[PDB]
Structure formats: C-alpha cells, structure tokens
C-alpha cells in the first residue's frame, strides 16, 4: 500500500471535507478525526474515495481545533492532516443580495443572512448567528456607464447609500471578517441592477 499524503481541508461556511492522495489502487482508506482531547474518531470506513465529509463533526463545535489521520489498508500506514480551526479558517460563501429599494434620495441594499451547516437543536445557524459582530459586509455600487468605484461598509446586513437621480446603479456585496488572518473575504455576490 501507499500512505495517504497532501492532506488538505476543503471548507466553506463550515461545510468541511478532508482531501488527499493518491487515487487508490488495490487499497482502501479510513479517516479518523480527533477532538484533540478525547480520541480518534473515524468518520469514513474503508472507502475508495480520496475525500471525507466531516461537516457533522466540526459543526458540533466550530471553535475547536481538529486533527485528522488517514489509514491505508489493502483490498498499517497512516498520515496526520494539518490542524484545522473552522471558525478562523473556513472560507465565507458567496453572498446573495436580498433586496434593493430606493428610499428617497438614498438606496437601501439588504444582504441575505446566509445559512450554514452549524446546527443547534433544530436550527441551522446563519453567518450572523455564528460570527455575530465579527461579520461585516462590503458593497460596490455604480452605473456601469461612467463606472464610479464607490465603497460602502456595514456592520449589519443593510446598506444606506447616496445616489444620483434617475441613474440606474449596479450592486455587488462581499462578506468580510476583518479580524481574520486568512480568508478574510468571501467571493463577490451576483450583481443586481435597477
């Protein structure tokens, strides 16, 4: 057999999947993840896949550090993953504009509160739920004709911006955790225009 290698955590909005190599020839894998202070819990058993969904484990506590290991068996050798702390490390997903509306000489732009895989009882917690005041949004607004790169920032889910009369603007939003070291920013939302 070959030991697994290049173990990576693929994660967005807490949806979390460990990946590795190689594509197995005459062998199988079993993944074990560790609470770090309990034990080695397997989540995948004797699979021919080179990935394991670990969402259900990390969403139990997203402010924990997780280790994983991948055992190799013939159709024994193992390898330790890098450390993964979900809260600090998981990628923010692409946001969606909920609504824009022309309130007087200003425009209101609302971002959807994105749902995550973190679960508490019977609620699937949202970005806002998990991150709270650590979460900020950025907006970009312009009419694609003269292209005026004007920026707005909000602590909530709503922007209140100044606009020119009769002018059709285009909008795109971004999710931002200023506090982070890595993956501070989501990808941009689909553009919405008047």
């Amino acid at each position: 057999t070959v030991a697994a290698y290049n173990l990576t955590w693929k994660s967005t909005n807490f949806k979390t999947i460990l990946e590795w190599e190689p594509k197995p020839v005459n062998q199988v894998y079993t993944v074990q993840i560790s609470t770090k202070s309990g034990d080695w819990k397997s989540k995948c058993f004797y699979t021919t896949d080179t990935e394991c969904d670990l969402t259900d484990e990390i969403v139990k506590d997203v402010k924990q550090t997780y280790l994983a290991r991948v055992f190799s068996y013939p159709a024994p050798l193992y390898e330790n993953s890098p450390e993964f702390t979900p809260y600090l490390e998981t990628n923010l997903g692409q946001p969606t504009i909920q609504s824009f509306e022309q309130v007087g000489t200003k425009v209101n732009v609302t971002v959807e509160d994105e749902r995550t895989l973190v679960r508490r009882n019977n609620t699937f917690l949202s970005l806002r739920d998990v991150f709270g005041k650590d979460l900020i949004y950025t907006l970009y607004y312009w009419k694609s004709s003269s292209s005026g790169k004007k920026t707005a920032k909000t602590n909530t889910n709503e922007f209140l911006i100044d606009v020119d009369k009769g002018e059709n603007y285009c909008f795109s939003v971004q999710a931002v955790i200023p506090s982070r070291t890595v993956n501070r920013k989501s990808t941009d939302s689909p553009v919405e225009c008047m």
Epitope: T65, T110, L125, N155, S179
Partner: antibody, heavy 120, light 114 residues
Framework: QVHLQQSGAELMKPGASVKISCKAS????????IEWVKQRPGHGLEWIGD????????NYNENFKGKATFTADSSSNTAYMQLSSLTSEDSAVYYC?????????????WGQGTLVTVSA | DIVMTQSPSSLTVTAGEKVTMSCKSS????????????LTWYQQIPGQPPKLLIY???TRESGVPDRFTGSGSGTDFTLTINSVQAEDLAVYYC?????????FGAGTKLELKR
C-alpha cells in the same frame, strides 16, 4: 471546564506601567476573544476592549486609547494588558473574560480579577 | 455610543416575590436581518465577577434556572426574576452585545427583605 487565570494582585506608583496576564486553559485559545473590563467599587462595569489571539485583532474603548495595550502570546496560552501613566481613575479591579460560543452570546467565562492600586 | 440605562436603579424585595427591571439601549439592538435582539444579561453576586445570565435578550444560558426570564425588543427589555430565590441576590447588568463599542448598563441592585 474552561479556566481563565488572571495574574496576582498588584501595587504600582503613579507613573510607569503594569503587565497583566490572562492565562486560559480549558478550550482553544485562538478562536475566542478575550475581554478587558475595569470595575470600580460601586460604578458598574467598564469595557476597555477586546483581542483575538491567533490573529491579534483588537478593539479599544475610545476613552482609553493612550492607556490600554492588548496582546496575547498564542503559544503560551496567555493574554496581556498593560496600562500606562497610572493614576487614581486607573486604580481598580481588572477583568479578563472569554467571548461567546454562539456568536453574540455575551461574555461567558470571567477571570477572577486583579486589584490595581495606584499610589506612591 | 449605544448607552444603556437600567431602572430601577436598585430595588429591594422579599424572598418569594416576583421582580422586574428594565433595560433601554439608546438605539435598537434589533438585527432585522434575522430578527434578533442583541442584548445580554449579567448577574453579579458578592465575591464574584459577572455571571452571564442570558444572550439574545431571551436565550437562557446553560445551567441558569428557568425562573429568570428575558424579554423585549429593540430598545426596551426586561429581566423578570419570577418567584425570587434568596440566592438570586446580585447586581444585574445588561450589556450591549451588538455593535462596537461594547457598552454597559448602570446596574440593578437587588437586595432582599426578610
């Protein structure tokens, strides 16, 4: 259990500084904010700001800038606040607490405090 | 700054009664995005630092008994210690838990008559 450990009680003279340590056991050090809180005898509670270990981010209460210094050594499980130019409005009890597990869930755990006493 | 004024400033009651105190942010802790009142509650008894009571105005923290009850929306709130225990003896503070700066109440001095 989670345990915030604040450094022992201190006396300093109305001039130079004082380093206070919050040593946190019982969880993952880097993923929760630590909080600094002044409490005076009969004054309610006062929020100096916060800091996230592992990314070193900080937010100060504007009335203090000039006074407070938040730091934490990731790799020794301890957060730090230094206070300069000590005075009487500095003499108080100082508090370290952990952020919320569920996002905006207040302060959850608190350090036992430390009395700052400022006189010659 | 979101200022918080608590009231009554103090209050003194007998064991067993029901108590109510009000908390009022200078403007709204209502995140219309997901309908949450971003207010928080502390109990501070003699000889110990703040105990966290309730988050999101009306979510009871693990352990904390069901006889305390948070309520209100936006800029008007209410801890109601229903059927006061003697051990409930504290000063309670609500705390803005929404936007920076992080702020506090004046505090509410609960004392016990007997």
């Amino acid at each position: 259990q989670v345990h915030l450990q604040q450094s022992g009680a201190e006396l300093m003279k109305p001039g130079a500084s004082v380093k206070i340590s919050c040593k946190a056991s019982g969880y993952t050090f880097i993923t929760y904010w630590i909080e600094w809180v002044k409490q005076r005898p009969g004054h309610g509670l006062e929020w100096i700001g916060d800091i996230l270990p592992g990314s070193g981010s900080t937010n100060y209460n504007e009335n203090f800038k000039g006074k407070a210094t938040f730091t934490a050594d990731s790799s020794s499980n301890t957060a730090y606040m230094q206070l300069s130019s000590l005075t009487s409005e500095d003499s108080a009890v100082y508090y370290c607490a952990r952020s919320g597990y569920y996002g905006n869930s207040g302060f959850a755990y608190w350090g036992q405090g430390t009395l700052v006493t400022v006189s010659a | 700054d979101i200022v918080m004024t608590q009231s009554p400033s103090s209050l003194t009651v007998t064991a067993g009664e029901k108590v109510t105190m009000s908390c009022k942010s200078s403007q709204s802790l209502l995140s219309s995005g997901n309908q949450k009142n971003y207010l928080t509650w502390y109990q501070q008894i003699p000889g110990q630092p703040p105990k966290l009571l309730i988050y999101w105005a009306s979510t009871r923290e693990s352990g904390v008994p069901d006889r305390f009850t948070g309520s209100g929306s936006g800029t008007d709130f209410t801890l109601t210690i229903n059927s006061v225990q003697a051990e409930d003896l504290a000063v309670y503070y609500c705390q803005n838990d929404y936007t920076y700066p992080l702020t506090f109440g004046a505090g509410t001095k609960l004392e016990l008559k007997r």
